[PDB]
Structure 1
Amino acid sequence: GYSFSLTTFSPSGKLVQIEYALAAVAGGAPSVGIKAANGVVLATEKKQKSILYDERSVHKVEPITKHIGLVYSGMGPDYRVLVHRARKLAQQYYLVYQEPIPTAQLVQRVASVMQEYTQSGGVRPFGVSLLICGWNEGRPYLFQSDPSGAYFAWKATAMGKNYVNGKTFLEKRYNEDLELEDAIHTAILTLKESFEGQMTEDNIEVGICNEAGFRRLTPTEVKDYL
């Protein structure tokens, strides 16, 4: 393999490869995360090209541990790699400390794997941003990790296609006092703002995180919420 960096500084001090990885994310399908007082919701568009695609086959909203879950915008097969890595990092942490990894410690480790693909030899950055949610120390957590390996803690955010419009919509609608069940509604509504046509309970996917743990809402439940 090539042992020299494929991401390097331009004369303006930019790392264009990372700027271009971010372009990939911004063209990805939309994703939303909202941290309510008693939980977090993750929600994403999983519109499929046809009706031949067995929608139930592959999942964009994925558990990492009992208490942490992920969603992403950008490049699906890049996401897969990260999901597997986060799962291995959370296990590694549990085998040492015998306590499930705090959300912010999972975010730092995963983000660190992302930064290495901005500097290591022969590789391109990840064309993915992550939203990670978790519950630990009786508090809900939501983070975004980008392709540069920078992370940020949000109350609520949107990414993928139409994120700027999405964020403005979440400025206006989010409050701190907001309970989960409501959070879920404004998650699903932020998606609607940019959705093509007829959001069913099989062309979005929704995960929740609270005291009980992290789980993917079942299509049956998504339907109720719609």
Structure 2
Amino acid sequence: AGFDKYITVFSPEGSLYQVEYAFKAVTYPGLLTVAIRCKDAVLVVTQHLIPDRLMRPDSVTALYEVTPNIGCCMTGRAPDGRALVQRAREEASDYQYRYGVEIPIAVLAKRMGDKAQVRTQQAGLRPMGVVSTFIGMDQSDQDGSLKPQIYTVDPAGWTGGHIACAAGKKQVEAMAFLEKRQKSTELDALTQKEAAMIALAALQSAIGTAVKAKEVEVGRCTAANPAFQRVPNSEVEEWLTAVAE
């Protein structure tokens, strides 16, 4: 009853205060990401803003490659996100050596949520103040096709699939735009051009700025080219004009 909040100890209302304080390290940099999957692709947009003009803008990034078919964005404390990439690259490689096949995206999200649960149960270890968003396309069963996947793991360890997610500062106004857009159409029937307009407009409704094409970076995975790659900046400009239309 002396501290109640300084190490991983249950509060008298049954909460962990080092979990609730690590959620606030996600919104503390002030950034934002939006992920969405269409019928045949996955998209991840994120705010890529450099305040200093003397900074090399192609070094600071949040989009990482875990395996050649899984990409991720790390929204939260930026050196903590680089730490969980190196953890996920070890787990995807040790899956490859031991089991011979590439790791499923739903399984790589589960094995990274088990790493976050241990750090919030042992008293000495600090939780990672970052929300991971592992995106990719899994091999479907009984037909052999590919299927878009989005998986998000909290700093507590809450893994789960998504149709469209958001993380960072004013992530509540980004969820509210996507649910309002969900009431009209059905997001698993839209195309890659149509779904790119929503994830960029959801990034506009929260920041209220209608940002430039260099102030974001977008990575994608498509059923034709299943490898994770980031888009060119010229293709973001073809999308930002359509949102203004």
1:107 aligns with 2:119: no
- Out of 216, 220, 225, which is 2:234 matched to? 220
Partner of 1:154: 162
Shift of 1:196: 5.7
1:31 aligns with 2:39: no
Aligned counterparts, 1:25-174, within 5 A: 25-28=26-29, 29-137=31-139, 138-174=146-182
The residue type paired with residue 202 of structure 1 is K
Gaps in structure 1 of 5+ consecutive residues: none
Shift of 1:121: 4.0
1:210 aligns with 2:222: yes
Q: Percent identity?
A: 34
* Maintained 8 Å contact 1:107/1:143: yes
Determine the C-alpha separation between the residues in 2 that align with 1:95 and 1:202: 39
Between structure 1 and structure 2, the one with the greater Rg is 2
The residue type paired with residue 80 of structure 2 is D
Partner of 1:192: 204
* Maintained 8 Å contact 1:6/1:119: no
Shift of 1:147: 0.5
The residue type paired with residue 24 of structure 2 is A
1:21 aligns with 2:22: yes
Shift of 1:167: 0.5
Structure 1 residue ranges (4+ consecutive) displaced by more than 3 angstroms after TM superposition: none
**TM-score scaled to structure 2, two decimals?**
0.85
Partner of 2:142: none
Secondary structure at 1:64 match in 2: strand
What is the RMSD of the two structures over their aligned residues, measured on CA atoms? Answer: 1.6
Deviations 1:45-65 (A, max 9, x none): 121122122111121111111
Determine the C-alpha separation between the residues in 2 that align with 1:198 and 1:172: 19
Shift of 1:27: 3.2
Shift of 1:220: 2.8
Shift of 1:120: 2.4
Gaps in structure 2 of 5+ consecutive residues: 1-5, 140-145, 241-245
Shift of 1:31: 0.9
Deviations 1:129-176 (A, max 9, x none): 111111111111101100001112110011111111111101122422
- Aligned length in residues: 222
Determine the C-alpha separation between the residues in 2 that align with 1:198 and 1:223: 12
Determine the C-alpha separation between the residues in 2 that align with 1:150 and 1:72: 15
**TM-score scaled to structure 1, two decimals?**
0.92
Determine the C-alpha separation between the residues in 1 that align with 2:69 and 2:12: 44
- Name the stretch that deviates more: 203-212 or 14-23: 203-212
The residue type paired with residue 55 of structure 1 is P
Greater RCO structure (CA 8 Å; 6+ sep): 1
Deviations 1:14-57 (A, max 9, x none): 00100000111133411111011111101111211221221111
